[PDB]
CSV table of C-alpha atoms and ligand atoms in Angstrom, one decimal:
chain,number,residue,atom,x,y,z
H,1,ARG,CA,11.1,-24.7,-70.9
H,2,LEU,CA,8.9,-21.7,-70.6
H,3,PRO,CA,5.6,-21.2,-72.6
H,4,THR,CA,5.3,-18.3,-75.1
H,5,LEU,CA,2.3,-16.0,-74.8
H,6,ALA,CA,1.1,-13.8,-77.6
H,7,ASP,CA,-0.6,-10.3,-77.2
H,8,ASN,CA,-4.1,-11.8,-77.2
H,9,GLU,CA,-3.5,-14.5,-74.7
H,10,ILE,CA,-3.2,-11.6,-72.1
H,11,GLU,CA,-5.2,-8.4,-71.7
H,12,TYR,CA,-3.8,-5.5,-69.7
H,13,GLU,CA,-5.6,-3.9,-66.9
H,14,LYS,CA,-3.5,-1.1,-65.6
H,15,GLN,CA,0.1,-0.2,-65.0
H,16,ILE,CA,1.8,-0.5,-61.5
H,17,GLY,CA,5.5,-0.3,-62.5
H,18,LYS,CA,8.3,0.3,-59.9
H,19,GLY,CA,10.7,-1.9,-62.0
H,20,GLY,CA,14.4,-2.4,-62.4
H,21,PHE,CA,14.4,-2.8,-66.3
H,22,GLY,CA,11.0,-1.5,-67.5
H,23,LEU,CA,7.4,-1.4,-66.5
H,24,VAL,CA,5.1,-3.6,-64.5
H,25,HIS,CA,1.5,-4.1,-65.4
H,26,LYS,CA,-1.4,-6.0,-64.0
H,27,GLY,CA,-3.4,-8.1,-66.4
H,28,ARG,CA,-5.1,-11.4,-66.9
H,29,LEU,CA,-4.7,-14.7,-68.7
H,30,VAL,CA,-7.5,-14.7,-71.3
H,31,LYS,CA,-7.8,-18.5,-70.9
H,32,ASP,CA,-8.0,-18.8,-67.1
H,33,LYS,CA,-8.8,-15.2,-66.1
H,34,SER,CA,-5.8,-15.9,-63.8
H,35,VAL,CA,-4.5,-12.4,-62.6
H,36,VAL,CA,-1.0,-11.9,-63.8
H,37,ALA,CA,1.8,-9.1,-63.5
H,38,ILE,CA,3.8,-8.4,-66.6
H,39,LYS,CA,7.3,-7.1,-66.5
H,40,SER,CA,8.7,-5.6,-69.6
H,41,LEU,CA,12.3,-5.0,-70.8
H,42,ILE,CA,12.9,-1.4,-72.0
H,43,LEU,CA,16.3,-0.4,-73.0
H,44,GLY,CA,15.4,3.2,-73.7
H,45,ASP,CA,17.9,4.4,-76.1
H,46,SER,CA,18.5,7.8,-74.6
H,47,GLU,CA,19.2,7.7,-71.0
H,48,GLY,CA,21.6,4.6,-70.6
H,49,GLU,CA,25.2,4.1,-71.6
H,50,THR,CA,26.2,0.8,-73.3
H,51,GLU,CA,27.4,-0.8,-70.0
H,52,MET,CA,24.0,-0.2,-68.4
H,53,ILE,CA,22.0,-1.5,-71.3
H,54,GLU,CA,22.8,-4.9,-69.8
H,55,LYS,CA,20.5,-5.2,-67.8
H,56,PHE,CA,19.5,-7.3,-70.6
H,57,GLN,CA,21.7,-9.7,-68.8
H,58,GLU,CA,19.6,-9.4,-65.7
H,59,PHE,CA,16.3,-10.0,-67.5
H,60,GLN,CA,17.7,-13.1,-69.1
H,61,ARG,CA,19.1,-14.5,-65.8
H,62,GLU,CA,15.7,-14.0,-64.2
H,63,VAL,CA,14.0,-15.9,-66.9
H,64,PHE,CA,16.6,-18.8,-66.8
H,65,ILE,CA,16.5,-19.2,-63.0
H,66,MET,CA,12.6,-19.0,-62.8
H,67,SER,CA,12.2,-21.4,-65.7
H,68,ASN,CA,13.0,-24.4,-63.4
H,69,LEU,CA,11.4,-23.3,-60.2
H,70,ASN,CA,7.9,-24.5,-59.4
H,71,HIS,CA,6.9,-24.3,-55.7
H,72,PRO,CA,3.9,-22.6,-53.9
H,73,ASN,CA,6.2,-20.2,-51.9
H,74,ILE,CA,8.0,-18.9,-55.0
H,75,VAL,CA,6.4,-16.4,-57.4
H,76,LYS,CA,5.6,-18.5,-60.5
H,77,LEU,CA,6.7,-17.6,-64.1
H,78,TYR,CA,3.7,-18.3,-66.4
H,79,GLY,CA,5.3,-17.5,-69.7
H,80,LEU,CA,7.3,-15.2,-71.9
H,81,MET,CA,6.1,-12.5,-74.4
H,82,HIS,CA,8.1,-10.8,-77.1
H,83,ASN,CA,8.1,-7.2,-78.7
H,84,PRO,CA,8.9,-6.1,-76.2
H,85,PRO,CA,10.4,-9.0,-74.2
H,86,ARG,CA,8.1,-9.6,-71.1
H,87,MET,CA,7.9,-12.0,-68.1
H,88,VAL,CA,4.4,-12.9,-67.2
H,89,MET,CA,4.3,-13.7,-63.4
H,90,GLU,CA,1.5,-14.7,-61.0
H,91,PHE,CA,0.0,-11.6,-59.5
H,92,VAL,CA,0.4,-11.6,-55.7
H,93,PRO,CA,-2.4,-9.4,-54.2
H,94,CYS,CA,-1.3,-8.2,-50.7
H,95,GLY,CA,1.8,-6.2,-51.5
H,96,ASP,CA,5.1,-6.9,-49.9
H,97,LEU,CA,6.4,-7.7,-46.4
H,98,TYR,CA,8.5,-4.6,-46.1
H,99,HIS,CA,5.5,-2.3,-46.6
H,100,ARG,CA,3.2,-4.4,-44.4
H,101,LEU,CA,5.6,-4.3,-41.5
H,102,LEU,CA,5.8,-0.5,-41.7
H,103,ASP,CA,2.1,-0.3,-40.5
H,104,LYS,CA,2.9,-0.2,-36.8
H,105,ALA,CA,-0.7,0.5,-35.7
H,106,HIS,CA,-1.7,-2.8,-37.0
H,107,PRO,CA,0.8,-5.3,-35.9
H,108,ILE,CA,0.7,-8.8,-37.6
H,109,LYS,CA,-0.6,-11.4,-35.1
H,110,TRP,CA,1.8,-14.0,-33.8
H,111,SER,CA,0.2,-17.0,-35.6
H,112,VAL,CA,0.4,-15.1,-38.9
H,113,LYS,CA,4.0,-14.2,-38.2
H,114,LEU,CA,4.8,-18.0,-37.8
H,115,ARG,CA,3.0,-18.7,-41.1
H,116,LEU,CA,5.1,-16.1,-42.9
H,117,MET,CA,8.4,-17.5,-41.3
H,118,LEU,CA,7.6,-21.0,-42.4
H,119,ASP,CA,6.3,-20.2,-45.8
H,120,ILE,CA,9.5,-18.3,-46.7
H,121,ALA,CA,11.7,-21.1,-45.1
H,122,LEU,CA,9.9,-23.7,-47.3
H,123,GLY,CA,10.6,-21.6,-50.5
H,124,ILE,CA,14.3,-21.3,-49.6
H,125,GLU,CA,14.5,-25.0,-48.6
H,126,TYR,CA,13.2,-25.8,-52.1
H,127,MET,CA,15.8,-23.5,-53.7
H,128,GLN,CA,18.7,-25.1,-51.6
H,129,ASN,CA,17.5,-28.6,-52.7
H,130,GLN,CA,17.9,-27.8,-56.4
H,131,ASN,CA,21.0,-29.3,-58.1
H,132,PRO,CA,23.0,-27.2,-58.0
H,133,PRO,CA,21.4,-25.0,-55.3
H,134,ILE,CA,19.9,-21.7,-56.2
H,135,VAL,CA,21.5,-18.7,-54.5
H,136,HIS,CA,18.9,-15.8,-54.5
H,137,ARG,CA,21.5,-13.1,-53.3
H,138,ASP,CA,18.9,-10.5,-52.7
H,139,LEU,CA,16.6,-11.9,-49.9
H,140,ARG,CA,15.1,-9.0,-48.0
H,141,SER,CA,11.7,-7.9,-47.0
H,142,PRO,CA,10.8,-5.9,-50.1
H,143,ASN,CA,11.3,-9.2,-52.1
H,144,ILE,CA,8.8,-11.3,-50.0
H,145,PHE,CA,5.3,-10.9,-51.6
H,146,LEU,CA,2.3,-11.5,-49.5
H,147,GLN,CA,-0.4,-13.8,-51.0
H,148,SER,CA,-2.7,-13.5,-47.9
H,149,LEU,CA,-2.4,-12.6,-44.2
H,150,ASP,CA,-5.2,-15.0,-43.1
H,151,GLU,CA,-3.6,-17.6,-40.9
H,152,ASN,CA,-5.5,-20.4,-42.5
H,153,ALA,CA,-4.6,-19.5,-46.1
H,154,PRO,CA,-3.0,-22.2,-48.3
H,155,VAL,CA,-0.1,-19.8,-49.0
H,156,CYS,CA,0.7,-16.6,-47.1
H,157,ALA,CA,4.1,-15.6,-48.5
H,158,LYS,CA,6.2,-16.1,-51.6
H,159,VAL,CA,9.8,-15.4,-52.5
H,160,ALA,CA,10.2,-13.0,-55.4
H,161,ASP,CA,12.7,-11.0,-57.5
H,162,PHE,CA,15.5,-13.5,-58.5
H,163,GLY,CA,17.4,-11.0,-60.8
H,164,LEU,CA,20.7,-11.4,-59.0
H,165,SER,CA,20.4,-15.2,-58.4
H,166,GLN,CA,23.1,-17.9,-59.0
H,167,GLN,CA,22.8,-21.6,-59.7
H,168,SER,CA,26.5,-22.9,-60.4
H,169,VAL,CA,28.4,-26.1,-60.0
H,170,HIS,CA,31.4,-23.7,-59.1
H,171,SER,CA,32.2,-21.3,-56.3
H,172,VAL,CA,29.9,-18.2,-56.4
H,173,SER,CA,31.3,-14.6,-55.9
H,174,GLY,CA,30.5,-10.9,-56.1
H,175,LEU,CA,30.3,-7.9,-53.7
H,176,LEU,CA,26.7,-7.3,-52.4
H,177,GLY,CA,25.6,-3.7,-51.4
H,178,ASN,CA,22.5,-3.5,-49.1
H,179,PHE,CA,24.7,-4.6,-46.2
H,180,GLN,CA,22.2,-4.9,-43.4
H,181,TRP,CA,20.6,-7.9,-45.2
H,182,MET,CA,23.8,-9.5,-46.6
H,183,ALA,CA,26.1,-12.1,-45.2
H,184,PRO,CA,29.5,-10.8,-44.1
H,185,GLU,CA,31.4,-12.9,-46.7
H,186,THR,CA,29.5,-11.1,-49.4
H,187,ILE,CA,30.1,-7.5,-48.3
H,188,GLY,CA,33.9,-7.3,-47.9
H,189,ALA,CA,34.8,-7.6,-51.5
H,190,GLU,CA,34.1,-8.9,-55.1
H,191,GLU,CA,37.1,-11.1,-54.2
H,192,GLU,CA,35.7,-13.8,-51.9
H,193,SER,CA,33.7,-17.0,-52.6
H,194,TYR,CA,30.5,-18.0,-51.0
H,195,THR,CA,27.4,-20.3,-51.3
H,196,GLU,CA,23.7,-20.7,-50.6
H,197,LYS,CA,24.7,-20.2,-47.0
H,198,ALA,CA,24.7,-16.4,-47.8
H,199,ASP,CA,21.0,-16.7,-48.3
H,200,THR,CA,20.6,-18.5,-45.0
H,201,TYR,CA,22.1,-15.4,-43.3
H,202,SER,CA,19.7,-13.1,-45.1
H,203,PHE,CA,16.8,-15.4,-44.0
H,204,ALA,CA,17.9,-14.8,-40.4
H,205,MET,CA,17.4,-11.0,-41.0
H,206,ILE,CA,14.0,-11.8,-42.5
H,207,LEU,CA,13.1,-13.8,-39.3
H,208,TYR,CA,14.3,-10.8,-37.3
H,209,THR,CA,12.2,-8.3,-39.1
H,210,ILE,CA,9.0,-10.4,-38.9
H,211,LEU,CA,9.7,-11.0,-35.2
H,212,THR,CA,10.2,-7.3,-34.3
H,213,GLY,CA,8.5,-5.3,-37.2
H,214,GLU,CA,11.9,-3.4,-37.3
H,215,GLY,CA,14.6,-3.1,-39.9
H,216,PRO,CA,17.7,-5.3,-39.2
H,217,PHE,CA,20.5,-3.1,-37.8
H,218,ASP,CA,18.3,0.0,-37.5
H,219,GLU,CA,19.3,0.2,-33.8
H,220,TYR,CA,22.9,1.1,-34.9
H,221,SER,CA,24.4,4.0,-36.7
H,222,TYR,CA,27.9,3.8,-38.1
H,223,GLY,CA,29.7,5.1,-41.2
H,224,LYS,CA,29.7,2.5,-44.0
H,225,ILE,CA,33.3,1.2,-43.6
H,226,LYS,CA,33.0,0.9,-39.8
H,227,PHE,CA,29.5,-0.8,-40.2
H,228,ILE,CA,30.9,-3.5,-42.5
H,229,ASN,CA,33.9,-4.0,-40.3
H,230,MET,CA,31.7,-4.4,-37.2
H,231,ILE,CA,29.4,-7.0,-39.0
H,232,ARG,CA,32.4,-8.9,-40.5
H,233,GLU,CA,35.1,-8.8,-37.7
H,234,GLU,CA,33.2,-7.9,-34.5
H,235,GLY,CA,30.1,-10.2,-34.9
H,236,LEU,CA,27.7,-7.1,-34.9
H,237,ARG,CA,24.1,-8.3,-35.2
H,238,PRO,CA,20.6,-6.9,-34.4
H,239,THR,CA,19.5,-7.5,-30.7
H,240,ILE,CA,16.9,-10.3,-30.4
H,241,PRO,CA,14.3,-9.3,-27.8
H,242,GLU,CA,14.4,-10.9,-24.4
H,243,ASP,CA,10.9,-12.3,-24.9
H,244,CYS,CA,11.7,-14.2,-28.2
H,245,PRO,CA,10.8,-17.9,-27.8
H,246,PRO,CA,14.2,-19.8,-27.2
H,247,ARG,CA,13.8,-22.1,-30.3
H,248,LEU,CA,13.3,-19.1,-32.6
H,249,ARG,CA,16.2,-17.3,-30.9
H,250,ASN,CA,18.5,-20.3,-31.6
H,251,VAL,CA,17.4,-20.6,-35.2
H,252,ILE,CA,18.0,-16.8,-35.8
H,253,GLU,CA,21.4,-16.9,-34.0
H,254,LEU,CA,22.6,-20.0,-36.0
H,255,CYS,CA,21.4,-18.7,-39.3
H,256,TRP,CA,23.4,-15.4,-38.9
H,257,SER,CA,26.6,-17.2,-37.8
H,258,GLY,CA,29.8,-15.4,-39.1
H,259,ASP,CA,31.1,-18.9,-40.2
H,260,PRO,CA,28.8,-19.9,-43.0
H,261,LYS,CA,29.3,-23.7,-42.2
H,262,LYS,CA,27.6,-23.2,-38.9
H,263,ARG,CA,24.3,-21.9,-40.5
H,264,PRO,CA,21.9,-24.9,-40.5
H,265,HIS,CA,20.4,-26.8,-43.4
H,266,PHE,CA,16.7,-25.8,-44.1
H,267,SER,CA,15.4,-29.2,-43.0
H,268,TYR,CA,16.5,-28.3,-39.5
H,269,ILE,CA,15.2,-24.6,-39.9
H,270,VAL,CA,11.8,-25.9,-41.1
H,271,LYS,CA,11.5,-28.5,-38.3
H,272,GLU,CA,12.4,-26.0,-35.6
H,273,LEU,CA,10.0,-23.2,-36.9
H,274,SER,CA,7.2,-25.8,-37.1
H,275,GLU,CA,7.6,-26.5,-33.4
H,276,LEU,CA,7.0,-22.8,-32.3
F,1,ACP,N1,4.2,-10.6,-59.1
F,1,ACP,C1,3.8,-9.5,-58.6
F,1,ACP,N2,2.6,-9.4,-58.0
F,1,ACP,C2,2.1,-8.2,-57.6
F,1,ACP,N3,2.8,-7.1,-57.7
F,1,ACP,C3,4.0,-7.1,-58.4
F,1,ACP,C4,4.6,-8.3,-58.8
F,1,ACP,N4,5.7,-8.0,-59.4
F,1,ACP,C5,6.0,-6.7,-59.3
F,1,ACP,N5,4.9,-6.2,-58.6
F,1,ACP,C6,4.6,-4.8,-58.2
F,1,ACP,O1,5.3,-3.9,-59.2
F,1,ACP,C7,6.2,-3.0,-58.4
F,1,ACP,C8,7.5,-3.2,-59.1
F,1,ACP,O2,8.1,-4.5,-58.7
F,1,ACP,P1,9.6,-5.0,-59.0
F,1,ACP,O3,9.4,-6.5,-59.2
F,1,ACP,O4,10.1,-4.3,-60.1
F,1,ACP,O5,10.4,-4.7,-57.6
F,1,ACP,P2,11.7,-3.7,-57.4
F,1,ACP,O6,12.5,-3.8,-58.7
F,1,ACP,O7,11.2,-2.3,-57.1
F,1,ACP,C9,12.6,-4.3,-56.0
F,1,ACP,P3,13.6,-3.0,-55.1
F,1,ACP,O8,12.9,-1.6,-55.5
F,1,ACP,O9,13.6,-3.2,-53.6
F,1,ACP,O10,15.1,-3.1,-55.8
F,1,ACP,C10,6.3,-3.6,-57.0
F,1,ACP,O11,6.5,-2.6,-56.1
F,1,ACP,C11,5.0,-4.4,-56.8
F,1,ACP,O12,4.0,-3.5,-56.4
């Protein structure tokens, strides 16, 4: 159940569009003056082959997944527009976590790093409590949008970009490609099954990057086959700094366990992060 918005329920402000299947624009809800980011579907007759034009399949999935999600730490879907098909999302004003962590001259202060860790944990906790659980499959720092970096803000971080997401009463499967964020059972083949526990591993890498300001596995360099084999068969993981608080170190280490069953439920993750 998602609301339909006309053309004159929203007024555009400007474009901003680094988007997977069309443009992104900033605008406003005429009713609220709620600020809003509008993602359009554009097939584009010329460039793409028939196979690539879906990609209508991705836009559709993102709508269907988002339609049931309502939580403060998940980017909210306000409505749908037609001609062209568009998702109207809440506008999140402070960019994304990946680009913020690149600013090394201005490191994020510790209390704000814990706010970010907990906000993202609460959003994934909510996903994993859905029936059936939502599997995002693309959790990484560019897909964490920052609402505010004030440590007393109601909401600092939100989970975004559910285009690859699954919610099935069956086994989930599919090879995943950004490998330094993805669980080992997802990077070997199309062939093997896995669950929401693959997102719990990605969340470990998000804890790592917030802790250190550095990209997961950037301390290693290997050819692609050897890198995958090391992560899958030799337990290769990023090095957690010696000064990491021990409760955070344990949460990260359990969350990136090679055995998906050993990665904790989010009620345990949330409790431990709240005690830091
Ligand atoms: N809800 C939102 N709030 C604010 N900005 C948004 C937004 N949704 C998208 N954007 C902005 O529009 C640009 C395009 O976003 P999009 O959602 O297409 O990410 P992306 O497809 O580039 C993920 P990646 O490139 O890592 O695969 C983003 O870089 C961001 O600046």
